[PDB]
Amino acid sequence: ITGTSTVGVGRGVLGDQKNINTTYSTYYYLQDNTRGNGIFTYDAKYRTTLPGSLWADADNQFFASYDAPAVDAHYYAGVTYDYYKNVHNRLSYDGNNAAIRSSVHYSQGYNNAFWNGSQMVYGDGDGQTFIPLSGGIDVVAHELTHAVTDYTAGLIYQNESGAINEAISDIFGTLVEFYANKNPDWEIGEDVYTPGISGDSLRSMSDPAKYGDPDHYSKRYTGTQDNGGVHINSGIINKAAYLISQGGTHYGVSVVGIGRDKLGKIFYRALTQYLTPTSNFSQLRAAAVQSATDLYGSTSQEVASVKQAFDAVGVK
Numbered sequence: 562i563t564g565t566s567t568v569g570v571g572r573g574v575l576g577d578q579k580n581i582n583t584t585y586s587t588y589y590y591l592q593d594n595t596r597g598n599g600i601f602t603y604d605a606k607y608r609t610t611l612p613g614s615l616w617a618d619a620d621n622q623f624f625a626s627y628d629a630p631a632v633d634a635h636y637y638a639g640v641t642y643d644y645y646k647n648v649h650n651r652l653s654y655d656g657n658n659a660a661i662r663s664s665v666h667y668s669q670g671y672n673n674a675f676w677n678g679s680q681m682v683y684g685d686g687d688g689q690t691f692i693p694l695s696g697g698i699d700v701v702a703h704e705l706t707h708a709v710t711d712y713t714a715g716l717i718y719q720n721e722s723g724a725i726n727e728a729i730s731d732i733f734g735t736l737v738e739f740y741a742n743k744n745p746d747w748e749i750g751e752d753v754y755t756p757g758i759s760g761d762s763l764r765s766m767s768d769p770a771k772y773g774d775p776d777h778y779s780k781r782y783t784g785t786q787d788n789g790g791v792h793i794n795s796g797i798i799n800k801a802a803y804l805i806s807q808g809g810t811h812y813g814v815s816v817v818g819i820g821r822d823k824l825g826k827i828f829y830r831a832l833t834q835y836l837t838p839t840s841n842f843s844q845l846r847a848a849a850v851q852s853a854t855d856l857y858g859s860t861s862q863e864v865a866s867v868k869q870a871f872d873a874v875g876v877k
């Protein structure tokens with residue numbers, strides 16, 4: 562909408578207060594004009610018609626329970642935009658400052674979030690498996706990273722290319738969580754998953770097997786559920802990424818860690834310069850090796866560590 566840029570205040574899903582960029586024109590809208598061509602947050606009103614209505618508020622104060630998922634979707638989209646701009650010199654998901662749109666309160670009791678090809682969509686959860694999913698910065702960044710992938714490598718959402726697609730979203734969701742530096746970890750979704758159970762998460766990158774996902778290519782899922790295991794076999798790549806960053810010895814193979822920032826550089830370059838819609842895990846290894854070679858040199862520790870990490874998870 563046309564209006565003037567303002568700054569509202571509210572509380573997110575976890576009860577934390579934060580400032581949000583809004584736009585005033587009769588109402589205060591969840592429209593942040595400070596980033597690219599805008600970040601826009603919509604109310605789906607418990608329905609499944611998208612996007613719903615641009616979120617309007619009479620007073621620029623967002624402290625109602627119903628407001629909390631919108632506050633967090635809007636704020637964490639901003640943090641994710643900032644990560645990609647400041648760390649990778651990428652302007653929004655298309656590289657040309659495309660407007661970022663999100664809808665919250667999608668459906669009833671909806672235990673998921675997704676990128677629908679055009680926008681982010683967040684359920685509120687059923688209150689037992691999940692609380693509103695925009696409360697997780699890693700979840701928001703995971704979703705927005707799907708848009709980045711779709712505009713770049715284009716990894717088809719099935720089988721190995723789809724597991725790479727998933728792992729890229731988990732990797733960058735985690736890197737955004739570290740960038741914001743509030744309770745960061747290598748787990749996925751811990752802030753919104755299972756409010757009655759402490760210490761769990763949807764997936765673990767450091768130990769995928771903790772939540773039943775493979776940590777070695779010999780344990781890959783080969784069936785048809787979950788689009789050929791895209792959220793299952795992602796564990797193999799998530800583990801490789803974790804090892805590249807943090808190091809470790811896994812199935813007897815030792816990996817010298819190089820840190821999160823270099824992990825992010827290598828995988829961002831692989832995603833945007835080398836991967837294609839049909840890339841498989843072996844091709845991802847090659848893309849990551851080449852990316853590290855471009856950035857750090859063929860004799861570098863960084864290249865050696867990428868090779869060790871893929872060796873450790875059985876990907877040649």
Ligand SMILES: CC(C)C[C@H](NC(=O)CNP(=O)(O)CNC(=O)OCc1ccccc1)C(=O)O
Nearest residue numbers: 672673674675676677678703704707718763792
């Ligand atoms: C219990 C769940 C939260 C676990 C998992 N989801 C995630 O980890 C995050 N959402 P996501 O990975 O973005 C879904 N996304 C998904 O399933 O893609 C299908 C699609 C294709 C094209 C258009 C619209 C939707 C799942 O779906 O099994």
Ligand SMILES: [Ca+2]
Nearest residue numbers: 618620622623
């Ligand atoms: Ca209000």
Ligand SMILES: [Ca+2]
Nearest residue numbers: 743744745746
């Ligand atoms: Ca965390």
Ligand SMILES: [Ca+2]
Nearest residue numbers: 699748749750
């Ligand atoms: Ca996390």
Ligand SMILES: [Ca+2]
Nearest residue numbers: 754755756758
């Ligand atoms: Ca939990």
Ligand SMILES: [Xe]
Nearest residue numbers: 642645653654
């Ligand atoms: Xe982005």
Ligand SMILES: [Xe]
Nearest residue numbers: 700703749750
């Ligand atoms: Xe997620």
Ligand SMILES: [Zn+2]
Nearest residue numbers: 703707727730
């Ligand atoms: Zn995903």
